[PDB]
Design a protein around this nucleic acid. Sequence first.
RNA 1: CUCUGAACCUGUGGUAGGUCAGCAUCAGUUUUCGGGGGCGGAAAAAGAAUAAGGGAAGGUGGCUGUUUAUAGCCCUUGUUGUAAUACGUCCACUGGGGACUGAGGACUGCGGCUUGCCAAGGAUGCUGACAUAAUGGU
RNA 2: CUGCCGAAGUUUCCGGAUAGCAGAAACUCAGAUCAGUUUUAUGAGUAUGUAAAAUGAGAGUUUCUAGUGGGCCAUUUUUGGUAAGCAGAACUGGCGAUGCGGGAUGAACCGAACGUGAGGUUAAGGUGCCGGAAUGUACGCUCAUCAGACGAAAAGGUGUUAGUUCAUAUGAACUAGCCCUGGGCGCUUAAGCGUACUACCCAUACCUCACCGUCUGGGUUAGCUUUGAGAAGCUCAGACGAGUAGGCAGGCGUGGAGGUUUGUGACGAAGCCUUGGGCGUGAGCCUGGGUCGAACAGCCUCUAGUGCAGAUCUUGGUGGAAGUAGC
RNA 3: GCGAAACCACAGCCUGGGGAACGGGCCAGGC
RNA 4: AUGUAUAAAAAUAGAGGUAGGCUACUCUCCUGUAUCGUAGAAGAUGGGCGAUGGUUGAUGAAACGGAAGUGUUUUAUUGACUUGUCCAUGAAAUUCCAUGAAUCCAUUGCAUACGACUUUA
Lengths: 168, 106, 97, 186, 124, 150
Amino acid sequence: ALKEYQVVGRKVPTEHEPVPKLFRMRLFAPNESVAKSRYWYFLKMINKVKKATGEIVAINEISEPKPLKAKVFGIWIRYDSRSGTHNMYKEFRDTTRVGAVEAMYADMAARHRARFRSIRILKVVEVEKKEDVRRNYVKQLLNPHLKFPLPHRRTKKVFAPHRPSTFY
Amino acid sequence: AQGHRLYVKAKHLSFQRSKHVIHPGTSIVKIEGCDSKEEAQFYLGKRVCYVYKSSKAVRGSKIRVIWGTIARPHGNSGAVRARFVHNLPAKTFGSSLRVMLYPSNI
Amino acid sequence: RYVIATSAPKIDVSGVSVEKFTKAYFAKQKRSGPVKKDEAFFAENAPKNALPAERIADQKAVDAKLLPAIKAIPNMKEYLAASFALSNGDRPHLMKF
Amino acid sequence: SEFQKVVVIDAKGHLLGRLASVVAKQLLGGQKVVVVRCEELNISGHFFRNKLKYLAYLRAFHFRAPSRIFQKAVRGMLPHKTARGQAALEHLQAVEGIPPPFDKQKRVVVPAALRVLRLKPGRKYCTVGRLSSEVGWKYNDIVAKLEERRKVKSAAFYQAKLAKQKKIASAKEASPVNQKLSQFGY
Amino acid sequence: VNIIKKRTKPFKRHQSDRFKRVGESWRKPRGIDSCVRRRFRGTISMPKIGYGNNKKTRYCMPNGLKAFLVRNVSDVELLLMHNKTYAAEIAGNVSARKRVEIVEKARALGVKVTNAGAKVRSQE
Amino acid sequence: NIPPKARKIMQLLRLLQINNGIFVKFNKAIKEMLQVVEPYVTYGIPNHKTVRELIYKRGFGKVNKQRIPLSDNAIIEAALGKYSILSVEDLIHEIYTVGPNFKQAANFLWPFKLSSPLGGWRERKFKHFIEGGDAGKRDEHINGLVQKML
RNA sequence: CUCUGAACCUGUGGUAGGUCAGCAUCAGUUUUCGGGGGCGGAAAAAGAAUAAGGGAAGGUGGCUGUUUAUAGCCCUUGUUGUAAUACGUCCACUGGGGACUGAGGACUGCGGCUUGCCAAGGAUGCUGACAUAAUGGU
RNA sequence: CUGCCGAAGUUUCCGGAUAGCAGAAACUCAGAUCAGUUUUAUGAGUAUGUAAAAUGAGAGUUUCUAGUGGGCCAUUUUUGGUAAGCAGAACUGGCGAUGCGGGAUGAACCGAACGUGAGGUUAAGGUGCCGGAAUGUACGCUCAUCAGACGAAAAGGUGUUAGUUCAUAUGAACUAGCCCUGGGCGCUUAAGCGUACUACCCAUACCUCACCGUCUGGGUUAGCUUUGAGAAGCUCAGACGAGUAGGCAGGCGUGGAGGUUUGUGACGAAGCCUUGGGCGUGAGCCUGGGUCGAACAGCCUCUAGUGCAGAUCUUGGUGGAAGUAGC
RNA sequence: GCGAAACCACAGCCUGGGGAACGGGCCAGGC
RNA sequence: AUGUAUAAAAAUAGAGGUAGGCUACUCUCCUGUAUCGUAGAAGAUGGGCGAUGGUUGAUGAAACGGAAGUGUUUUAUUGACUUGUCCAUGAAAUUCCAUGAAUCCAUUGCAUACGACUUUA
């Protein structure tokens, strides 16, 4: 299960700079070991700050403030592929920001055969406004007349005596 | 009518084997009616027997019994591992077995 | 270990003394008898065993102090007469005793 | 779960591979399995797809009967080179339609092999008997004719059983003992 | 104290069942390309020191006693103090005149004899 | 299939067998020495229970070049009494808090011959811990793995 | 007189070995179910209850638009509170079930109870049946 | 016959003398040194060598003495290549001396390196059936009328799936994935592919125990009524276990000799036969029954014409081909 | 009716894959 | 062997039952963890009461069942059992698990490696 970790890190003080800058990042990882490692990847990737010259000063797991209210989340990712340069924006409807990312990691792997290492989520933001939704399926999920038939569940107890009802 | 049947019907499936190596010391027994490893915990330690017949009679009885005891579950589908006083013959695959209710803890 | 304790209603047993039921009370009578050579030793005119009336006398007391208890509640007399058995589709692990 | 000494399976709407795998595993368990209505077995995929699959097989003895098609699938899932897999095959009887000895016996189904519970809606599937009709089998027309004849007789028996069942059902509530001690869930 | 035997089957020479000219007595396979020497799967076992039996129960018969070969009455008298550890075994070449006197002497000494009823009958 | 460079290092950590475990002093020299053998070893920060349970169940002293279990305080006292270590909780205290006599206390212990983890490793064992495997540094998750090997 | 378990009579006194089984109390190893508690985490997040304020909705009432009505929802504080729960971690806290082993052979030791006793430097009890078959072997 | 050690398969000069590798003996040492170690820092040019902190192991010799004195594959580095491939060197290990689980199968791939066993747990790989283990959960992708499952290959597609972006609900241009075209049985909201999480299967691997052996470290005599001094004995503890060439140790068996068993034998020696029994890891040994008919063995030592499956071995006997070719 | 000799590890269906030939022994299929 | 116990069809993305006169109804499904059956020295001996029914055996049977009917019923009488509701005795010391044609034949040609083949006989 993924967890949203808030990681704050900075370079160690030296004679050149008395006080260093503080960098905070939000990223998703199963355990704090992965989050700290991914956080160091981004700073090197971005600020070109060495891990050996820096340290992690704060780590904190973040829980969903409103996990009982359905929301729509917009997610931006960067893709490393055969071309090695791509960027896409996707929308998901759920109750937990972490749940969107787990669902997000599912479709990239399903469609684009992508991996956890390649994807670097730039930003996740809740899209409260219905008009801001750019995806048709979410818009269909936002109508006041949501009522649809059941998707088939294809459910030892071998050798049933009677034909199953397989209906409502 | 209605017999006695103070036991539970079971079947001998195979030995504790890998793909190419068999271990006849332990036999895999399917206690029919048990469908998961948690359910198999009830039958652990019970006495299981293989009742068969031989044409030659001993003490006026043509029925011979090999006694065993259920040791541990095997897999997620309620199959168990049983060790018998004599290793069960390889020809008794698919043959029936009787799982007693003793020793009892209920 | 060779007994299944059913959850049937209890029977009043405090009214019957059970101090006489010790290990020696049920202990098998010692295999003895100074049989001299021949007769039963060789000719095999062996004696026979029989339960003494003392065991029956104590037994006759326990049902005297137990039968009213089982008669007070319904079906108890018919319950103990029947013999337990397993029918088709009976799962001992699931169904409660 | 619980087993029987002999099992009659209705192969109407059962996938060929799924049913054969369960049957082959049951045969190695010592059970006796009889599969009826082998000509109504269904296989996932277009009827064109299985026609060329069978046509490729045509290009040993190429059996055309649907029952022998099902037996071939069951045979491949058994250690037929050894005696244990040889005895398992002799414990299986695959027939088309419902012969009289199994006509008046309970016919169970395998939900793990049912097409409705295992195939996506709208997917094209082919019937084994229908598929075998254009490969050499020439008894499909008569087999259907007996099937409707059996259904009419079977339906008449069901009405007789249902009408008889109404009598005990009506008398079930007539007896006060039912209502007096129904606290046991019965 | 129970006697445990690590193995009861003997170690037969490889390919001894295919040829009469090759005896059953164990011979170490010297062939380099031999599957038996390299100990593949399905190849027979070889005598290893791991099969060696417990020192305390070594040389012990299934009844718990150690065999002691006896050729005359003088041999059987040596087991006066060791009658709970050793069993007298009369040699095969000892005549029936001496076999009877060894058995009668071993009876008073409380010594088990492994072949006490050989080359003799009884007369009650 | 171990390169000679990593083979020597694991011999300096007394890790000559699979599943063997030892206590090390996390300093500069040990840090990058472990970086060489990252694909072959896993390590982390042991809590108090991990240090206490390993000493109590798998604790074996090296008494006169022999593997003598710590079944008596007089065993530890006879071999570590020179450093004011007299009991088993004193041995645990020296290991856990890394006292002034950590080198002698750690070297006194035989390498912990652990069993296979109950429940097994992850699906892929030789990937790095961050990548989803079992090798490499794993912080406090070493306790959950040691609990599987006891 | 002592001794000869010395022969026999009288003892009807006692105590009774090998293979295979069952159980109990234990020890070593191990597996699998529970119960209780401490601590940490935003001193969980929620949430209910809840005194308010504001807002809009996929809009109740009024009438798509509308703002609590003749349904309610969201946000914020307040709110009982020191909530509960989940998760993580810990208990030298505890209750069962299963399996495999019993090496050693007077006493020593380390401990716990109170000389003795003990789950403390490795299994003993209580029974049976068969033995005159079972156990095995070929 | 068993047990314990155990290479090298190549530097260098040049068939060799060296050396290296592997052992033996005598020496001096654990308060001394050492390392296919990692550092620190000095310098020098992210690395480099040197000098001096961590970690591990007691180290350094001297003398003489067996074998090797081919390579294959793989990794990396490589120089040129050049239809393209490739070739060439070098760098490094594995196999070559090595079985085991998986990999359909297979010698180079994935795990793992080996005394005899009981129990437990795993690795790699797996859980529809063959086959031990979820026809497990949660998402998606895929319809093939050759999928998938384990070079014509670029691309095209009135082929899709998700779609993005831009134009004004549509269309265009695009973004990728997959399909079409270019081990078995069987599977198709999978028993396919990708991701995540539980459960489960089992190696000679790991853990606990028992036993064998070896190595190592101890204890043991006014020989104490614990009696356990074949001191060549007894005893306690820990570790370890592949193995070709080769090195070393202890044992089994055969003919004859000295000694011994106050030895066995016509009441049956030796030999042979046996689905009789027992002992030993083994070489082998003991024994019952049958057959047989005159000699023979255990122990200490001595001795040698002393142990066979092979030599297109020697001698003898005997088969299938064969009642064949045929006469 | 009389009557050999050569030869003789053992065997004897295919199909593929099995890298070293592998088909005659091995693995998955038919017989 | 150990209850060797169970006959709709049909859709499933809707069906069946139920009822009215194919059009309008209703109810159930959501599996069998169901239903039937089951008490006794494996099931004793009587007294009953109560069913005066039920459970069946035995034969004597007619009908139905082609497919592979080989079994479903309908019974007729008789034989018993009945734990439906109750009683009175009984079963144990095993005193803790082991439980007449054809072929050959002759004939035969109709046949042709050989029989076979082919009638007659």
